[PDB]
Design a protein around this ligand. Structure first.
Ligand SMILES: [Zn+2]
Ligand SMILES: [Zn+2]
Ligand SMILES: [Zn+2]
Ligand SMILES: [Zn+2]
Lengths: 70, 73
DNA sequence: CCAGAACAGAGTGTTCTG
DNA sequence: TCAGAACACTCTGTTCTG
């Protein structure tokens, strides 16, 4: 019921991992697209519903560490 | 001789709200002080603010603006 | 249910003006 | 000189569709 990436309400099992929709479309867009994500902290940024927009790098990192794939 | 924004290190357009800055940090500061935003740092309140990452943490950006001495009067 | 498409908004940055 | 208006773009999130 809870997104393993940001803790928001999970819509379902997407790309191998229980997530919400925002993290679903984010993951696809992040992996295929050419983005210049760069962390401003220490690679341990808190990714929750409020702050997930802040550091796309760490968000993508959590997605990958969760095992998400296309 | 070229001037540098004291907030993000981008090219400063001039002295805005009391501090040498670019346009983006200017309008950002205005919108931030007046506007109702939910800025919250995801790190340790010491995020690196440069041209690439200034979009990342508005909280730390506003913090640098205030510590630089920016004001509306 | 799940993937992808598509529509809409927030936040941002530049150009123009006096 | 700098302040503010306004348009346009990027990124994101929800809704729609196959
Ligand atoms: Zn999520
Ligand atoms: Zn980060
Ligand atoms: Zn700046
Ligand atoms: Zn921060």
């Amino acid at each position: 019921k809870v997104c393993l990436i940001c803790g928001d309400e999970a819509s379902g099992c997407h790309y191998g991992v229980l997530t919400c929709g925002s993290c679903k479309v984010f993951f696809k867009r992040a992996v295929e697209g050419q983005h210049n994500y760069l962390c401003a902290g220490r690679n341990d940024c808190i990714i929750d519903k409020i702050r997930r927009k802040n550091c796309p790098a760490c968000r993508l990192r959590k997605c990958l560490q969760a095992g998400m794939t296309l």
